[PDB]
Amino acid sequence: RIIVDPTTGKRYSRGKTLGKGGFAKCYEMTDLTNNKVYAAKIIPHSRVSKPHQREKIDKEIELHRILHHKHVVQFYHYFEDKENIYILLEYCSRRSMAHILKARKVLTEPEVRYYLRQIVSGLKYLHEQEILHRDLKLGNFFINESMELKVGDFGLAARLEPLEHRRRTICGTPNYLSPEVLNKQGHGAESDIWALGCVMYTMLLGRPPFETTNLKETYRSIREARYTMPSSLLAPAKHLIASMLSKNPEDRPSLDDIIRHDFFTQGFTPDRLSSSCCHTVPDFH
Ligand SMILES: CC[C@@H]1C(=O)N(C)c2cnc(-n3ccnc3-c3cscn3)nc2N1C1CCCC1
Numbered sequence: 001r002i003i004v005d006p007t008t009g010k011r012y013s014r015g016k017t018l019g020k021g022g023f024a025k026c027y028e029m030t031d032l033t034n035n036k037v038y039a040a041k042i043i044p045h046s047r048v049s050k051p052h053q054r055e056k057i058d059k060e061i062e063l064h065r066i067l068h069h070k071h072v073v074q075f076y077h078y079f080e081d082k083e084n085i086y087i088l089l090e091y092c093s094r095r096s097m098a099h100i101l102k103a104r105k106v107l108t109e110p111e112v113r114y115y116l117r118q119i120v121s122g123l124k125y126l127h128e129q130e131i132l133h134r135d136l137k138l139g140n141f142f143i144n145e146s147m148e149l150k151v152g153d154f155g156l157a158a159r160l161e162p163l164e165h166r167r168r169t170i171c172g173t174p175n176y177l178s179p180e181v182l183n184k185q186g187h188g189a190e191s192d193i194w195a196l197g198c199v200m201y202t203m204l205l206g207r208p209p210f211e212t213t214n215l216k217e218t219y220r221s222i223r224e225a226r227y228t229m230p231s232s233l234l235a236p237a238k239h240l241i242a243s244m245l246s247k248n249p250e251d252r253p254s255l256d257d258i259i260r261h262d263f264f265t266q267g268f269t270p271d272r273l274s275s276s277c278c279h280t281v282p283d284f285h
Pocket of ligand 1: 020039073152
């Protein structure tokens with residue numbers, strides 16, 4: 001299967017299927033020119049005939065293509081032929097963190113420190129760019145062969161809007177809805193920090209702090225921001241989760257405040273995590 005870009009004449013080679021992605025059918029896509037493999041979203045035009053879902057991928061491409069950071073999935077190139085839209089992205093061979101957490105149930109503290117340092121690095125970049133991810137979940141943290149975390153799936157992504165200039169309606173259907181979004185206040189930077197609490201919690205426990213059904217029954221408990229803290233957690237981990245899950249948005253720590261917490265500084269953290277950690281528990285110390 002040869003795929004030629006009709007506006008350039010660049011030829012790509014389509015490899016194995018990688019999975020599903022809503023509108024995306026995902027296959028390996030080799031650039032024959034470089035000579036390197038990427039992970040491609042292939043979206044037939046028939047999928048996106050409606051103006052709003054056409055605009056959806058358009059903002060996703062527009063916003064994503066301008067980001068260059070070691071902990072954000074690298075945009076490579078986008079093009080279209082007669083039937084498909086093509087988005088080529090950093091190939092992450094050891095899949096996502098939602099995959100690892102299924103296989104492990106629960107991670108060790110040094111693993112949680114190893115992964116969250118990378119997550120906070122990639123989000124700092126984005127937040128300085130002034131782009132809100134708006135869909136941070138374990139599913140969107142992509143890992144490569146050499147075990148490096150890339151934050152991906154832009155899409156529910158958007159540029160930061162001042163409070164008075166803000167989109168108030170709930171955007172799409174994300175994994176971890178903040179108290180402030182539920183109060184018709186919109187999605188700020190601290191709504192991304194909220195999700196990092198839900199992420200960290202789930203890395204240490206294998207279950208989210210709140211129900212993720214997005215049902216209107218679930219709204220009250222989240223607002224409210226009340227939940228059970230399990231005794232299994234060590235003191236410093238407990239404090240930082242409670243910090244990031246503050247009820248009031250401006251009570252939540254900054255990303256600089258986060259990576260300097262006792263949770264990070266007072267424990268051991270490896271420079272390189274072994275790939276055995278995708279399955280097996282790592283050794284102590
Ligand atoms: C293309 C969408 C997404 C992605 O954005 N990146 C960067 C990615 C980068 N690398 C892989 N990748 C590469 C080899 N295996 C995968 C994979 C990750 S999760 C299931 N397969 N997949 C990616 N994916 C997948 C494809 C289907 C759902 C998410």
